[PDB]
C-alpha cells in the first residue's frame, strides 16, 4: 500500500535523525568507555550484576535494523548505558565519572532531538 510506504519513509527519516543523535552522544565519550559491550570473558560475573547490558555498538546495530520506533525507545537504551555503569562501578572510578559526564553532556543533545522529532512529526 501507499500508506505502508509513507510509514517506511518516516521510519527511514527517524532512523537518519537518530543516527546523527547517536554520533553526537558518542563524541561525548572520547575515551570509548561505552563503545562496546562489557566483555563476559574479562568480567565473567557481569550478568549477575547487570540484567540488561547496553552499549553504543549494540544501539548502532539496532538503529541500522530500523529497530527504534520513536525517540523514547532510543533514550531508554542510552539511559541503560549510563545507569548500568553507575551501579556496577563505584563513585570514585574513571568509569562512574565518565558516565556522569556523558549524562550531563548528552542532556543538551537529547533536549533538542526531542523538539526536532515533535516538530518534524
Swiss-Prot record:
* Superkingdom to which the source organism belongs: Eukaryota
Question: Tissue specificity, please?
Answer: Highly expressed in testis.
Give the source species: Homo sapiens (Human)
Q: How does it assemble?
A: Component of some HBO1 complex composed of KAT7/HBO1, MEAF6, ING4 and BRD1/BRPF2. Component of the MOZ/MORF complex composed at least of ING5, KAT6A, KAT6B, MEAF6 and one of BRPF1, BRD1/BRPF2 and BRPF3. Interacts (via PHD-type zinc finger domain) with unmodified histone H3. Interacts (via PWWP domain) with dimethylated and trimethylated 'Lys-79' on histone H3.
Describe the function of this protein.
Scaffold subunit of various histone acetyltransferase (HAT) complexes, such as the MOZ/MORF and HBO1 complexes, that acts as a regulator of hematopoiesis. Plays a key role in HBO1 complex by directing KAT7/HBO1 specificity towards histone H3 'Lys-14' acetylation (H3K14ac), thereby promoting erythroid differentiation.
Task: List residues of cross-link (Glycyl lysine isopeptide (Lys-Gly) (interchain with G-Cter in SUMO2)).
Answer: 41
- The record's disulfide annotation reads none
Name used for this protein in its record: Bromodomain-containing protein 1
Q: Which residues form the Bromo domain?
A: 9-113
Q: Which gene encodes it?
A: BRD1
Task: Indicate where this protein resides in the cell.
Answer: Nucleus; Chromosome
